[PDB]
Amino acid sequence: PTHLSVDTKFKTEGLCVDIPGIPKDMTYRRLISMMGFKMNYQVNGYPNMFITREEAIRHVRAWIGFDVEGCHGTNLPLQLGFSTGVNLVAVPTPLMYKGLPWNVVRIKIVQMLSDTLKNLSDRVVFVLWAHGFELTSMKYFVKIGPERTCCLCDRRATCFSTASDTYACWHHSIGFDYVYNPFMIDVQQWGFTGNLQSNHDLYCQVHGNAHVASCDAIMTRCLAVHECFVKRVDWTIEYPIIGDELKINAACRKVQHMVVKAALLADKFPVLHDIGNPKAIKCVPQADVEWKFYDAQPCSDKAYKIEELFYSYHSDKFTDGVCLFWNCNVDRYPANSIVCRFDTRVLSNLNLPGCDGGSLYVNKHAFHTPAFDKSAFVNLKQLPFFYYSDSPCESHGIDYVPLKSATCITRCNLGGAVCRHHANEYRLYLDAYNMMISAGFSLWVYKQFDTYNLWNTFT
């Protein structure tokens, strides 16, 4: 059940305006054949150019929406549009490029895919709403064959040079002219009614349509993301480490303990309401407080309505004590909240563009996250950086400069001179906090929150 059988049927109705008279009965086998490629009865780890939904979801970091539009079929110029917002015009002789032959166009295609994908994926998955020209245009920039390895590293090969007769991965592909063993999924096979725009625009107001190839390419990928990650969710699917996943996750746990520990010391709430992950543990297990959990899965579509989370009658009294929302995205936090909220606008290898302003954050699991909205935080303020330790000043077992900081809140600093232990810990905590922030996480707190209140927790 692993790969998509070439003997599987392919619904051709989508193709019959670009390809009038196309048989209603077709396999992948005959489609790949008609696209001008030959699989050659090949057991060599590339059984089909086309892949399952399941496979496409494991390989989401690899998704590039692709669309081709006639300009005036060997006769006429072709507009090539990618979900990177690029358009190339190929001649048979937002970014909008003038008409140029295939021999140069294929070079630019390799450079674009390599720069976009080298820090994301080992492959490309062309995400299609297939009408004909996209499929018949592949012969001009794609070569297939047995799975191979990069000529300069152990990475699987994604590109091919006709100049040197060699193979490269995305990192080593400079000057290569062919996409090598790409993958593709036609979204129109999934069983929709009506065209791309009518389907896309059900879910998403953020991508317009200027009637240009890059726009459909963007809408195709967006609709695909909606289907696979918003409406359907799957937290059993794992995803490989490609960046600072582990450091970020650790950072997140250290900042959550720090911020909540201090909140309790400063304002001594009698009850904390912990709203979100139904797996959550007390992030401050020593704290005096009544710790009450409330279960809420990460909202992949629209942010939760605080009205529906709280009212309908818990501690019932959510206005008692403090509410901890740690990546539990609501429309408007109450005034007595500690909040961690993912900023969907961050640029990183972990954050992929999503649906209707949301982003798809892929760190071990894929989490589609609703658009970041500043108005949710109106009852709060941004939490300032600080470091709080009540740990003893005792070094144990760094090469040092004395730390001076107003935000190192320790006995040693109170006493005039920060000890070496607290300077090592302060600098590790600040590095973790910077990691987490640049990963796109933002921190918000009740307005009464004042780190001045922490100093008298030593006397």
Ligand SMILES: Cc1ccc(NC(=O)[C@@H]2CCCO2)nc1
């Ligand atoms: C990708 C692809 C798929 C099919 C075809 N062509 C056909 O099926 C023939 C030619 C005219 C109608 O029947 N060409 C390209």
Ligand SMILES: [Zn+2]
């Ligand atoms: Zn390589």
Ligand SMILES: [Zn+2]
């Ligand atoms: Zn969209």
Ligand SMILES: [Zn+2]
């Ligand atoms: Zn100290």
